[PDB]
Structures are given as structure tokens and as C-alpha cells.
Design a protein around this nucleic acid. Structure first.
Lengths: 49, 74, 104, 185
RNA sequence: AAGUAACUUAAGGAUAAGAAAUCAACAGAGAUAUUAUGAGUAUUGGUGAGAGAAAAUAAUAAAGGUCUAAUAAGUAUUAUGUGAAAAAAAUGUAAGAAAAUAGGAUAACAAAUUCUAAGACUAAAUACUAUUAAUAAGUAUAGUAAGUACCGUAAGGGAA
RNA sequence: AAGUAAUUAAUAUUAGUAAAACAAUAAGUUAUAAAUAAAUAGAAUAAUAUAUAUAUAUAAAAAAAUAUAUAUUU
RNA sequence: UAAUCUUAU
């Protein structure tokens, strides 16, 4: 038989559930494009110098 | 150690009369740890109080204070 | 641009995926529950009031920063101000010489 | 510190048994009462399986003289028998403890508290006995918190009728069997 | 000699290790493992016999980073008896912290620097066995029987 | 039926290569400077030790020892 | 003496 969860463990679980419920940070296409453009600019600058 | 014995205390609340140890029901006392584990804590006679907000019983403490005041008056 | 982004090293790419640059993460230590909580800083958990260790441990963070420096993608990473690590030329310039060096 | 002599221990990984699968050759008579303790049961200082030793195993090392003539000695922990009060169980529980363990118990403010601390370190330095004690305490706490309603009689009412129905078809029916049938329902 | 033989226990196809409180040194690197080099070098030793790193540089190697913990106290440390010849981490007894405004690391101290213990997971490169395949300046006394005949009360021995 | 194997170090002889070798991605080992306990010292300021280099010493010398210079570096 | 603690039922 599985051992029951103590109070602290339950509270931690609840917190984790709350965290999950919130909207997750996800890397957008736009952000990637912005990064990629910056990388390209950096490469161009390196080539120049 | 001897120093340790002198200075080590444990904050408890008694939930029972203890005439030998001079502790009356509801009193919140910094007792010796040995005393607590051996005599007081047995049979729900006292209780350890780590967090003063959550653990402690308030009404019993108030009653004890009232008794003490009455004793002082008399 | 997308192809260039893809060409970035793996660790850096992974970091960008899981802590993206749209969110302006905090410079200072924050609540662990917060959305803008910096993964490089030790954030305090609001209930217990204990500082959680950084989500990216210090070595990994340093590696990520070095990767960003290499590919010029520093500002898209969240700030490393209040983590005590400086890096390369900035570290060289900003540091005070040891008491032993200046005053033997 | 570390818990090397505890967390080194490995136990045979039991295969998850599906309801429709074939039996194993040796199935036990009486069922498992307690949960499985992650770290098995100590196979060295078996003295410590019976008590709350706080992960304190016996050391072996060298007695060394002025001549540096090394001789093997062992260093036992300061074990002590101690009947300590459980608030949850409403009885005092007598066990072998290290003096260190007794000190920790005193610090934490009770025996139940010591048992139920959620940290992995505590779990490691609970014994199998300690694990069983923890389970007993935790289960009791859960019961106190949550009584069943916050069904048996209905079953008892239906049982004789069910038996009669069975008899009418032709077969006899026992209680125990009835209980077995209508556990999941 | 040597943590070797031996005895005990337990786990898996492997296991162990593994994602830095690591090294270093004012530059820096970035899990673990195995090998080469460093190097018989620093260190060490009845300063005898002898024992002996690491950094760094390469090989091998896999997707190799990754949340599982509401972040870790009788723990850090300390005192002490021990404790992989170097190089420490551990451990009995007992004292015993602190919140990143913190804490580990260096007789010590001052600077500086680095890292986050007392919560976790982790392929592959590896050991071993068995098989198949390939190669044999290997074997016909390492070429098939036999653990048999036989000796021994026995463990055990052990032919042609 | 009996001086053998593995990991080292030293000497010889030969062969390749040669002020380089080995290895070749790097990294390292050996020689290319002698020393001196060790440090930041180091081999003609007009040529053969009567020069210079280091160690003791020292103002720099001399004095021991060892070492270094006489078209092309060994 | 509800520290330890022996014995018996």
C-alpha cells in the first residue's frame, strides 16, 4: 500500500499544480527571427573586421 | 556538558497539573528537554511548541495567566 | 534568419526554447512563482521563504553566456548583473587588482 | 554527511502485475501490510534494523599505540532503549535509539514529527522499523483528518436477497464471497 | 604485502560515475568514464623499502543535459578517536551554525576568486558471459571421452 | 624438462633523418648551454685563455672547478 | 524518583 503524503509534500504538489495552470513561457517564431537577424548582423560585422 | 545542561531549554505548553515540577495546566514553560520527553509529554500531558502561532493553545495559556494573577493578588 | 538561428549550438538553442526572450526577466531576485523569475538568480519561494537554487546552475549559466557572446546573442538572454560572474573583456576592465598586487 | 551504507542498497525490482497475467511460482500467504521502504533493510549492522539509529552504522578502524602498532577495533554508536510518547498513536513507543537520534527528536518536538519529516535524508536514516512507524503515524493522521464520510449497511441488506436469488437459480453464496464480488462496485 | 586473497550480503544487464559548493589562478575551463601525454613530476617515506597525483593536451565515446525537489540542521562546521602510502572523503562519541544581507573552497589572515552541501535523474564509450563472423610464425601433451575410472569416511583429489 | 614475457632506463652497432629528431590535428619527449641548493645570473668590449659564463667570494678583480669562443653554427 | 533498570505474572 502506498504511503500517504505529508503536509509539506501536499503543499509542494499544490504549488506545482498552480504553476502548471499558469500560461507557459514558449519561444515564439518572432523571437527566433529577431535572434537570427541579430546573429546575421554579428556575422556580417565579423566578416567586415 | 555542564554548560549545555544549564542553558539548554525546550519551550513547551503543559496541558495538565504537575505539582512536583511546579507547572500548572496551560502554562507555557522553557523546561529541560529530558524532563519533557520523560515526564511531561507522556499521556498528552504537555506539548512541544516550535511555531508559537500554530502550535500553542491560547485559551489554556490565558487561564494559566489568570490563575497566576489570582495567586499574586492573594 | 531561421536557418542561422537553427545553426546555433545546442545548449543555447535549448535555453532559448525554455526561457524565451519575449519575457523580460528580472535583474533582481524574485518570487519563485513569478513569470519573470531569472533562472540564473536564486529566487525566494513565497510560502517557505527559502532561497531556491538557480534553475540554471552556475557552470551551465556561464556556458550559455559564453555561447551567446560567441554568436552575439547576449541581450536576448536574461540579465547576469546580480549573479557575480563577469566575462572576458568586461571582467578584465571592471575588476580591481588584489590588495597583494597594489599593496605588497 | 552521506548515507552510503543505506543508499548503496538495492532490492530486486518487482515486475508490475497485471490482472490478466499469469501467476508467479511463489506467491505469499499473507498480504503486504506496509509500504515498500525504498532502501530495503540493512544487511550489515542488523542490530540497527530493530531501532532508530539515524543512519549510524558501526565503524571498524585501528587502535594505534605509541609504537604505531595497528590493531583492529570497532566503534559502536551510543545506543539506548527509550519509550517515547507518540501524540498520533496515543501511546509511548519503546525502541533502540542513538543518543544523537534522541537529541534530534527533542529538537524537532516529538517522535511523530521526527518520523514524518519529508526530507530524503530523514527517510534514509529511518530504519525499516522507522519506516513502519512513520507509516503507522501518517495513516493514523489521515484517518483523523478524513473519516470515510465528511454503504456497509446497504451491502448487508442486499446480501441475503442476493443469496436467495442464487439459491433460486441453484447455487449457494457466502458472505466473504459476496464482499469480494462487491468491493469495486 | 593489501583493501589483495579469502568469507558474507545484495543488484543489474551491465553496474558504478555523472551535470560541479570541480579545478584553477587575475587567464580561464565547463557532467562522468577509459586510455595516452603531463610524469615517475610535484608530494610522500624507520625521508629505508618503497608509494605518487592534478591541472592542461589530446584519443574514445552518446541527444548529452535535465527537473523529480515547495531547496534541504542535528547537517555546514567544530573537538576528538579513526580514516584510499601522495592525494581526502567519510565515520563513533559529542557540541554546533548562517539566508544569498548567505554559505563551501586556501595552517592561518587579508585581499581576490570561484562555486551552491545536507534533494534528484542520466544514454554511449566499460566489465563479464554466450553466440556468430573473421584472423591465427596457438594447440593433436591447449584437439572433443572424464570430472568418468579410481583414491578419500569428507571437503576434496583426479587417470589413461 | 629449464635466461622467458610485459613496462622502463642506460650503452653499442646499423639504418633513416639531421641543428634538428619523434610525432604530425594538436600535445609532448630528447637534443639545441654550462651551471647553481635557488632567485630576476648566462658564455671574445681587439681573440686561445692571459677573453668570457656560472658557483664561493666581491667595489671589480685574482684564486677552484666546470664550461664557452680559433667559408662556416653542434 | 513516570531517568535508567532486574524479575515475575
Amino acid at each position: 500500500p502506498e504511503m500517504p503524503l505529508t503536509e509539506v509534500r501536499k503543499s509542494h504538489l499544490a504549488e506545482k499544480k498552480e504553476l502548471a495552470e499558469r500560461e507557459v513561457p514558449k519561444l515564439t517564431e518572432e523571437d527566433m527571427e529577431a535572434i537570427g537577424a541579430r546573429v546575421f548582423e554579428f556575422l556580417e560585422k565579423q566578416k567586415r573586421e | 556538558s555542564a554548560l549545555t545542561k544549564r542553558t539548554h531549554r525546550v519551550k513547551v505548553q503543559v496541558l495538565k497539573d504537575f505539582p512536583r515540577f511546579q507547572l500548572y495546566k496551560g502554562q507555557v514553560a522553557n523546561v529541560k528537554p529530558s524532563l519533557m520527553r520523560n515526564y511531561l509529554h507522556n499521556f498528552n500531558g504537555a506539548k512541544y511548541i516550535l511555531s508559537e502561532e500554530h502550535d500553542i493553545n491560547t485559551e489554556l495559556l490565558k487561564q494559566y495567566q489568570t490563575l497566576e494573577a489570582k495567586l499574586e493578588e492573594d | 534568419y531561421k536557418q542561422y538561428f537553427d545553426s546555433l549550438p545546442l545548449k543555447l538553442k535549448s535555453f532559448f526554447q525554455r526561457y524565451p526572450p519575449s519575457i523580460k526577466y528580472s535583474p533582481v531576485s524574485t518570487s519563485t512563482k513569478a513569470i519573470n523569475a531569472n533562472p540564473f538568480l536564486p529566487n525566494k519561494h513565497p510560502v517557505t521563504q527559502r532561497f531556491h537554487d538557480p534553475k540554471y546552475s552556475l557552470r551551465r549559466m556561464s556556458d550559455v553566456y559564453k555561447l551567446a557572446l560567441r554568436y552575439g546573442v547576449e541581450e536576448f538572454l536574461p540579465p547576469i548583473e546580480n549573479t557575480k560572474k563577469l566575462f572576458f573583456e568586461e571582467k578584465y576592465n571592471k575588476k580591481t587588482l588584489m590588495k597583494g598586487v597594489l599593496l605588497p | 554527511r552521506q548515507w552510503r551504507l543505506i543508499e548503496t542498497r538495492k532490492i530486486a525490482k518487482q515486475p508490475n502485475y497485471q490482472v490478466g497475467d499469469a501467476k508467479p511460482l511463489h506467491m505469499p500467504k499473507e498480504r503486504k501490510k506496509f509500504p515498500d521502504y525504498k532502501y530495503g533493510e540493512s544487511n550489515i549492522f542488523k542490530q540497527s534494523n530493530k531501532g532508530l539509529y539515524g543512519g549510524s552504522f558501526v565503524q571498524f578502524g585501528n587502535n594505534i599505540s605509541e609504537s604505531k602498532a595497528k590493531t583492529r577495533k570497532k566503534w559502536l554508536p551510543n545506543v539506548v532503549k527509550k519509550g517515547l510518547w507518540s501524540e498520533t498513536l496515543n501511546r509511548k513507543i519503546s525502541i533502540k535509539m542513538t543518543a544523537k537520534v534522541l537529541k534530534t527528536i527533542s529538537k524537532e518536538g516529538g517522535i511523530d514529527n521526527y518520523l514524518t519529516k519529508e526530507k530524503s535524508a530523514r527517510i534514509k536514516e529511518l530504519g525499516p522499523t522507522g519506516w513502519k512507524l512513520r507509516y503507522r503515524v501518517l495513516k493514523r493522521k489521515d484517518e483523523i483528518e478524513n473519516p470515510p464520510h465528511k454503504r456497509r449497511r446497504l451491502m448487508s441488506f442486499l446480501y441475503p436477497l442476493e443469496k436467495l436469488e442464487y439459491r433460486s437459480v441453484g447455487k449457494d453464496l457466502n458472505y466473504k464471497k459476496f464482499v469480494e464480488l462487491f468491493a469495486d462496485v
